[PDB]
């Protein structure tokens, strides 16, 4: 669960 900005 990573924020969009992280690839």
């Amino acid at each position, epitope marked *: *669960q*990573l*924020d*969009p*900005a*992280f*690839g």
Partner: antibody
Amino acid sequence: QVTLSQSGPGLVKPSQSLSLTCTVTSYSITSDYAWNWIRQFAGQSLEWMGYISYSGSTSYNPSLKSRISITRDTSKNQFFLQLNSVTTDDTATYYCARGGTGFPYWGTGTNVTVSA
Amino acid sequence: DIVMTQSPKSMGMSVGEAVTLNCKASENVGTYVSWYQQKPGQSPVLLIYGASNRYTGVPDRFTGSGSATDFTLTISSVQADDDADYYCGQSYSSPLTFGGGTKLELKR
């Protein structure tokens, strides 16, 4: 739990380039997450410099796209930041952080003064 | 990239009173706004993420609301303890950006 330590020269002359090392404890940089480099200028304003993903991908701030280079060392569990041709204006506090749900993990920061 | 503006550059309240910070995005950042607290000679600490998710071991006096372009951070009751700088960031688009920040000063 997750912890990060930045280390690097605390002084560099203009024109020269700086290299900082971020050592990560109790987590594998290959496991998951984005491994970032951020900086807070004198005025306390912050600037995201870029990151390297757990799988070798890197992303940079377009405003430093040609002076920066972030690589890693999987066997030692660390990621570096090299910034070429530094100028007085790069004097700032460099931090490394783990990206995910924002930046929940920051190193304690290491001050860098670009001066001759 | 996307500019995140923080309106009140500075501010001062008394203990017990509420405080409302504001964070604006030049464009849509869905709900990927996070709020940080930065005390004297210390590094940034994540307070809220996902626009309204109180982070681990952060007191309930801290809450967050907002969505796509307009965000706020509320501190139920201020404590002398809360002296610090508060920044906001968006992790929605390619180059992550942060607001200019807002200092909070206690009044006695």
